[model samples]
Target: TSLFEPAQAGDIALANRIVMAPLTRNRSPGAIPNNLNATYYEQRATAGLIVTEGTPISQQGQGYADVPGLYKREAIEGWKKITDGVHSAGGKIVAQIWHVGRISHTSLQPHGGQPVAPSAITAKSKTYIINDDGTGAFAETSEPRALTIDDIGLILEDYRSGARAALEAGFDGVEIHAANGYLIEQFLKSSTNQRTDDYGGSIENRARFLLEVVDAVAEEIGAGRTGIRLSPVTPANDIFEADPQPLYNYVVEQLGKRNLAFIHVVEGATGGPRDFKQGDKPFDYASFKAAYRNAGGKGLWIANNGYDRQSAIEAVESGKVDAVAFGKAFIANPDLVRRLKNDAPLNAPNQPTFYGGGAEGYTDYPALA
Candidate 1:
């Protein structure tokens, strides 16, 4: 298969195997998507698929300032304009529904309260926010409160509501953000989950919340329209699993049964190295795919993190992964698909303009003009 060939990932269809990875740009203000957001995504509509930035499922799920949300009426309406533009540009877009959990600041929480998590531990991580001077700054994540059983149920409702809202917002599908040491990852990893209850201690118990969330989301939207992102061993945001082999083995097995549209996996340290390992053992990504495949998972397997054009083409052609999702490359090259196919050089990304920016590093990226 060619990297440029069209393919189907469950309910969603793509023009090629190059996908624009979901990135947190921190451009929205008041958790709302604006016209600028639409323009930014519309500009990159050349990708095989566009997975939106981490969109908070609720105000309680909000972690950073200016990030968009899918919980409210206006936020849903805002995303409609974005989806409309991407479709008009002949692009397929999916909303990445997110809940940061403990990787958050109290200020970002509703009513300026403590962030919620599986346990009460504060992450040794930083959250982006507009400081007093209105300059974008990174602040230490605030301490979090452990969620009560009732809170867990409430959050499940939030996921259901958010999934439903994405369809209302005209998204082609929804990608659940269960990766990057966020809420779902917090529950998945043992170091962060210390509870004696059903959500902690044992691997099966720790995996309960995530599975419940998956089932809830799948029920809300068709399983064919539900996808998920997983980073088996990325230490991003200061998290690690001592024994992720069994954990993720069970995860993909369960996911396979659901028949999700796609499974986007961050191969190594997200944005770092492809050879990154977890615990004392090297993670076998091939085995991971086998677990899913053996479990009857029919979703498209999309590999991400640090993929260059040649490597991306090789992976898709070799059937190693059904597709490749490019992060920084897609950011700097709006016509990323065409550039790769034509062997054209890509524009370098401006570091400062990456987050909390207007048009300079966003829609202004030159597109083979």
Candidate 2:
């Protein structure tokens, strides 16, 4: 909670107060973290903590082409370069393991197979590419299939393999991507889960998939080296959970029981309009903070909303949040620590070149120039 001071996120000692939150850069394709991506990450390795983009932990977990994965041996080596780069810059990094679920389309799947989710339902959101294919052609999402009960255990193992790859890739820890209406989010949302097996029909059952994934990752790489990301009521990517309070309450309680590294919660509407059928998002910050701390989860409390430098410092200094992750700020200001320390002006990120573009606006954004 110290201003511009070192903090303990589980057993990891962060170098500074600034945390580079995970922001998806579509530079990597076909689930491989490429050299350009590695260079981009290394360029901004001055932050206290660097959580990588959502890297798929398994094959089916891949919802976008070239999104990067940990399951592939080649991927392990690719990510090793990235972590090595960060470490060389005297920074600690963690991989945010992901599984895109029904958000995927045949373009991102093998043999044009349908994407999988807790139920056969499809989210109404558009696919993530802000451009056409490499050929400059547009595409739409494909139909999805409901994951059968038998696939649950296998999915857990996939997360386990992800943990192993993360460790081998030289990461300090791993963060399970349980947000953005992905596989874990799909299971977490009651509206999307209509299964009748032991994995559904109740809060415990609905949260089973994410909890098991956490357990699997912790088991693979010690419990102290894992974290989980969640957006309780922040309905993003067309995902809606009827009652996120009780569900996340139980989820955090269970996570606390395991004693994982940390749990990052996204607050407010994550780039979505409030006039949709899902209604306006209910950002109950007080309850989430209270429950998570009270449940005996004692690693670190990272708050990931739309927080600016001054506000982020205040939140941490208030003795409530352990750390604050800047999504948009970090994108434009890689050396945010120095910028904030000297009170230098910050640059605005160009939305036009954010996704599927060259290094322009990717790593080309200079410091205060």
> Which candidate leads the pack in lDDT?
1
lDDT of 2 by residue, 109-142 (tens): 7676898888888677666532445534235556
Name the lDDT value of residue 59 in candidate 2: 68
TM-score of 2: 0.94
lDDT of 1 by residue, 119-142 (tens): 999889888878774886789999
Alpha-carbon deviation at 48 in model 2, angstroms? 0.6
Q: Using Cα atoms with residue i matched to residue i, what is each candidate's TM-score against the true structure?
A: 0.98, 0.94
Off by over 4 Å in 1: none
RMSD of 2: 2.4
Model 1 scores worst on lDDT over the 10 consecutive residues at 128-137
lDDT of each: 0.91, 0.80
Give me candidate 1's TM-score against the actual structure: 0.98
Residue pairs with colliding backbones in model 1 are: none
